[PDB]
Design a protein around this ligand. Structure first.
Ligand SMILES: [Zn+2]
Length: 196
């Protein structure tokens, strides 16, 4: 009927020193990347009958969650944004300066608002079934307070109809912004594959 997926552009990510992507044994998606690096994202979807000719928009959020507040709740909670640290905020030269992340090389027109949480909204057109763009993180795990460092950061996207109703969603279950993405990615893969 209808589905949506978010993934990194594998071709480029495949052997990059700056980022790495993997799937868990449970098929959830994991991304590790350095801050200040362009991560190539591709959002794809298939729509049902009633939306075939709909004008749609795509919302992009970057939130945190833990065992106490699950992913489905967190991604739609306007108060769950991952917060940029003080020093990266004031040192920021991309507007809005306090956003943890930015969208570049977007094939689609986009706008930004923090009203209901830091969100980039891609304006699309009837018939669009994919959205390509780079996302770049301007703060990192190392910057956060121990309690926040323990929470999981999540990149979530929502496909909305003309009336603003979410009709599909997808996310990268865990995103980590670290110094050596290949170290963490490798440890993750070995631990997963060890699982008989
Ligand atoms: Zn920072």
């Amino acid at each position: 009927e209808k589905w949506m997926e978010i993934d990194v552009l594998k071709q480029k990510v495949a052997k990059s020193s700056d980022m790495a992507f993997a799937i868990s044994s449970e098929h959830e998606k994991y991304l590790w990347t350095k801050m200040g690096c362009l991560v190539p994202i591709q959002v794809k979807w298939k729509l049902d009958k009633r939306h075939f000719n709909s004008n749609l928009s795509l919302r992009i959020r970057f939130v945190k969650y833990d065992k106490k507040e699950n992913v489905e709740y967190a991604i739609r909670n306007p108060r769950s944004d991952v917060m940029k640290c003080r020093s990266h905020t004031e040192r920021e030269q991309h507007f809005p300066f306090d956003s943890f992340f930015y969208i570049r090389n977007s094939e689609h027109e986009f706008s930004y608002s923090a009203e209901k949480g830091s969100t980039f909204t891609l304006i699309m057109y009837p018939g669009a079934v994919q959205a390509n763009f780079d996302i770049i993180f301007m703060c990192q795990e190392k910057c956060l307070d121990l309690d926040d460092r323990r929470k999981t950061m999540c990149l979530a996207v929502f496909l909305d109809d003309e009336n603003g109703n979410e009709i599909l969603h997808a996310y990268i279950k865990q995103v980590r912004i670290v110094a050596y993405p290949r170290r963490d990615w490798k440890n993750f893969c070995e631990r997963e594959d060890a699982k008989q």
